[PDB]
């Protein structure tokens, strides 16, 4: 398995009849959730990893009993106030130990906007979409054989705005979190090199009083060197995702095709060229209608008739 | 595997034809119960657990062997009352050890009435959605074309309590159970950092007399802060599915729309806009056709028609 | 997989075309069966395991070596008479060493009942349901087109008690396994808790003169304060099925509705209200057609109408 | 897994279209074969297993290398005559270091049997019975209607003992090696709890003239207490199954019902009530058919007219 | 599993209904990506693997516990400016260590061009290969039964870029990554082989006065003589693709038959012979038909006649 | 799992609808890329591995981590020139570690030609041989019945070498690959069986001047007995596919039978008995059709008759 499988597992497969997410809005947050878990599991791979995720040096007159005491109680004691000094403060320390629990974190933060479109949204569209599309044939049937059912209820889409409402907030959900990781990874990485390096001392209770133990043992979180690192390709890939979800809120120039000018071939349509510039419902089913009408027969026939017009007889003929 | 498993595990999968649990509903009870199984999961992840639960500082004159007994026997000792001592009392050395059997008892208190509900409600159930969601398509075949059973059904239902009363009762139970969570989890995360540490002795039974034994080893439960940290993020989520809960009961209030209306458009249809504000088992129904006849044909071709509406000939022109 | 595997393996799954087990009787055994198969598999958890089942304080003169052969011995030797001290005598030795393997016999002789009425009389049972259930379509299909073997068939069974006492012995051994597994569950959390601790002589044979070893090591059986603990949760379960398997005796007042009623409606059919308060395999069969023939087309159709009446024409108008 | 595994995978499990067995004949070889593999998988697993098999007391100026020769040279000297001493001389210790051995070899040679059921017998029975109840078919076809061939086919069997020999055969070898299994597990139940104790030399070859190394070892079988415990529960239910496996020898016997005269009532059919007190095939056939023909569509309506006999025209009726 | 898994898993298996890649792209795209991932898997492999990646040779006087820690801190310390000395300088170190997380990088960057391709121009391409494909057999058709839309559709992709240039951009990246990757191997192959050895010191923080603790500790990076020989492997292979990718981009050089010259049997074709030698999307959807319609019937068919012409009737005699 | 898995795995298993490889090609090919992956996992196999691939004796003054050290830095230095010395010279120390990937590195090299088959012949091969096929169907019903396309296009085939040639240097590269293979490991099995043993030394760097440490440490690599016994059974192996190779070369003279002279029995057959003594694709063509037409219904008929014949109204009559 090793490395390679995380590259299997990972990388070379999707691991989370229409589609209801975007191509943009399914890669972006496939990467925003799928590369924290990767650099998760890269991070204690036996490759890299050596062993304990701490050590401390114990007096030579210790028995391994007493300094296995003293790796595990330190282990404990780095979140532990008053047994600890470092010159950073406490706080990088518990950056350092739970790590692994904060890139987990913003892996779930960054799931959950695209799960409540799955739930609050997609069953909402997935009925309409299929509407549309069916009617859209219906048109073409009735070109070929040469009621505005679609296009009244198009024009209905075009004075709503409450699923557009749900897809910005959760774009807007998505764009928030990334910068917040963005925030905290750059500080994660400027956190000195040697402050995985920290004082611990074992001096409570019954033990507070034995001569024969030191004031201080040295301890150090071996891995940290690997989460810094990691921590800042992290950071270089959501700082390149920021564009790319800002880039999304823009759905009023998103739509790459007026296909809508492909069915105006027909003398059965009607100028519905509501490219609302206004953030209307139906600016939104655009984009879906672009993702999906590329797979309508109708759509496949007219589009080639629309390229060679760059005649209805033809379509009988193809 | 490591943490990354988990989340492919627990967040990305339903890890628990018609729907016969509301969407709130089912998103509660996998949140309430599989919240804790993933926090018992990550608390004893390799990536943040160092080793052993325990260890004790035996004497530098202690053989391994002794060190190991002595590790073993305060793990054994931290629920026995005359072989410890702890400032805190003995109370949450308890808690401490049986911190997973604790959360998993939540988990399963959780799971039961969503289980009952599954057993004692949804077969019941699930006969007369389909009886009632077929006389619908009837009611709209027969206009199309243009006996009131399934209205005299529905009022039947109007005069009857069986069913609500068996969800009102296990949505009562799961709020219960999360309360009384919040209400542990809340001590739990109030426990001082350094009810971890405690005094333990083996000098019983042969032991008593031996000179050579220290009296006291003092030990640390080191797992305890991971602990702490998680019951916080679980008091957090089960403080915000608490009033989520609480919003379940006020079913009269719940229903979003009067889909009666859509159907009202047809003169075969009947003003059954029986939006009971009693709790009657058929303001439930209510609720799980909501959930399910989004699907039916006639609805979606009605609703069309409704929106548009915001003329019988269309039906057959559609 | 941690504890959270359990939960998904005994808790969400049933781990173990018609209904040839009653609901009650399926829940009960899959308790009585499942919640030791359970409480075995969290006592062992390396959550709550911290390693070997027994530790023993060698001398530290003892090398590792001989102070693997002291625990290893001494947990041989929890079973031999002539090589231990205890104050409670040697037989809770016994129960904590074989702890495991006394409920796992619970769990096999409460399953085996259960077992047995799958091959000794759900191949019996099955045939007769199949028959009786399609004879009363066609009694219901006779009524719409508006001879009775069903109904002297059924007059036969009221004459019989062949298949009700297997199941009532079936049950009658369930209650008598759970009732016995209460009384030693209530024995063994009884135990006093120092009983884990015993004392324990490697010498004999060569040892027996060997001034070096010490006459008595002291051990502890480390697990027992876990087994003590779920065998209390084992016996509060436990006392809970008591009652329910008590009730499932109660057969002729078990009939929850007279379904036969719903066919009375029908001038077809004939007073078979043979609701026979004599134990007789009618009655049973009346449980086992409840529990089946609510999926019949028949009893759908029949049971709205029978629900209004709170007309036969309307049979065809549905 | 733990030992819950083991009753997943071995008790709740068939673990090895005619039914070509008998029930008692698939129940008694289940538990013959069945037992003994439960029996060795729970002997060595982990919640009652401590470790190695052996050990041995070396000296405490023996290194740990030392010792893990003194162990595992001790594990081969139990089968070798002349580096041993044991008061119950070595027969004892073979059996308990191959007590897993021992107890898969009768396991095995306890299915062989079976197999060769499976292999010898089964498909000259699987032709004759397909044609034998097809031909019953047949005979209320031509009664419903209203050549003798399997008749005459039936009344040749009555004059062959070819298949019943290899039957009997196939049982009195069961019987015989479960009757040895229970003469073994009675002696080896027998034998003295403290044989599992015995004295080790290494002092052979170079080794003889060191006078550092002590002239005898102390070892112990630690799980021979398993074993031995375990072969108990074996002999018990072994014990159990040699009347069993008795009672399947009185073929002539062992007809539960005269199901030929459930077909006497009609008039096509003939006097064939051969139950055939000399072990002749055709009374083995017997038995297959009341295994099989239980399913026959014939069967079921004919024996509903035979209980209720306790009319040819109430069979057009049905 | 060992090394011959590895064979099984990236070698014996595409680990990776329309050919919408070229099958030498596909090919080379397999052997850049899979390779590494090989290579890593090898590198750890257990065969080769002995232990840890560093060891140190720390003082005799050092105990086990302070042993393991001088490992841990060095394997640390490899990343640390302060803490090292090396006559190479650091860098190699960084390289030496993070060689897996290395070569894993070039295996993910050589798919993601791959991946673009798979998204960004196969639905574009998809549909207009089984456009085209579907027409040819309608010429044949036409043909044997003996409007030219999809030659006027063919003439307008003449007249575009659009597809090409996605193609080469990919294939340009794909060969800039395989250009670094082997300058990057070239460089850590000519790595001096004492570079894997290094001095660490421990003396920081308190450890800094002790004059107990050596000043230097020597480490050796164990593995480092099996990535640069791996690394050789690698830097070969890369080297044999780099022509193979240059070659890819000769597009209208690559065309290896004239496919429609074989169509151009027929008297319904024309002479669009377009093997246009300016960079246009019909030039590489000529790559694509000869990578597919191979398959299609009428090809089949026709070449056949084209080759044994090295006549129509012959192909209602085939 | 075991030795015995291996067996199922790579012995009793095709572990790599035409036939479009030869079966004597085929299974040189499996068995030569094959044993050598069963060869490397049998080395290493639990069964005969004791541990670690070397040891070396360090002084009885050394710490365990000291040993450890000079263990894993000796592995290292096996490769590296200044830090050994054996009279054999460095390079069959490299031999010896690097084994199992020169095995796999066989392995892999005899398996590209196979594979270069399947990707550049095999697709060119498929179509013409379905054609072939069908062809010779159509001349068995116009037989039976009573244009020469196909003749005319085997004609055409008699004319090129094109296939034979790829078919030719894939086995001649497989012949090359195997002479190199019995080459090394004739080599390997004539190394020293002592060269396994070296002297390695640790005084580099800072230890060069270290007094307390042995100039010389003697090392053995363990597991050198092993590889050259299966060194000598994988050249055995290969000697016996030399000649098979060899063989598969006489294409002209490998045809075993004139399947065309069972079709010469019918009269719209020709001679063409074109066994071509020059290397022509035709004669290769015809060991693919040997390989796949005896599962002709047309052959397999008419085979019948030419057998006998050692008419056409037979055919009819089969």
New interface residues.
């Given amino acids: 398995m ?3 499988h995380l ?2 597992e ?3 497969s999707d ?2 009849g229409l589609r209801l997410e975007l ?1 943009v809005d399914k ?1 972006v947050t496939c990467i925003a959730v799928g590369l924290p ?2 650099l ?3 991070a ?5 990893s ?9 007096p ?10 003293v ?3 330190c ?2 004691a780095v ?4 047994s600890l000094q470092s010159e950073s403060g406490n706080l990088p320390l518990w950056l350092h ?2 790590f ?2 904060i890139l ?1 974190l913003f ?2 933060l960054l ?1 959950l906007p695209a799960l409540f479109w799955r ?1 609050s949204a997609a ?1 909402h569209l997935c ?1 309409d979409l299929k ?1 549309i599309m069916e ?1 859209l044939d219906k048109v073409y049937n009735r070109a070929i054989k040469a ?1 505005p ?1 679609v296009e ?2 198009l024009k ?1 889409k075009k004075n709503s705005s409450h699923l557009i409402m749900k897809y910005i907030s959760c774009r807007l959900v998505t764009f928030v979190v990334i910068l917040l990781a963005c925030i905290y990874l750059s500080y994660y990485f400027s956190l000195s ?2 402050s ?2 920290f ?1 611990c001392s ?1 001096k ?4 507070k009083n034995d001569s ?1 133990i030191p004031d ?3 301890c ?1 979180l ?1 891995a ?2 690997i989460f810094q ?1 990691l921590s800042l390709i992290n950071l270089i890939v959501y700082a390149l995702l920021i564009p790319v979800v800002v880039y999304t809120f823009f759905i009023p120039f998103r739509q790459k095709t007026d296909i809508l000018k492909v069915y105006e071939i027909l003398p059965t349509f009607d100028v519905l060229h509501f490219k609302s510039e206004g953030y209307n419902d139906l600016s939104l089913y655009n984009l879906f209608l672009e993702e999906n009408i ?1 797979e309508l027969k109708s759509y ?1 026939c007219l589009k ?1 008739l629309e ?2 017009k ?1 005649p209805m007889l ?1 379509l009988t ?2």
Same sequence: chains 1, 2, 3, 4, 5, 6.
């Fill in positions: 090793a490395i390679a590259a299997t990972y990388v070379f691991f989370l191509a890669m878990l990767l998760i599991s890269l204690f791979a036996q490759e890299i050596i062993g304990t995720q701490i050590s401390c040096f114990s030579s007159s210790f028995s391994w009993a007493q300094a296995a005491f790796d595990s109680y282990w404990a979140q532990q106030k008053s130990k739970f692994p629990y987990l892996a779930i799931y739930f069953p009925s509407f009617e009621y059912i009244q209820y209905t090199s040697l995985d390096e004082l074992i409570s209770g019954v033990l024969t201080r043992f040295q150090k071996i940290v060197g690192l590329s496949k080639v390229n060679i760059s033809l003929n193809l």
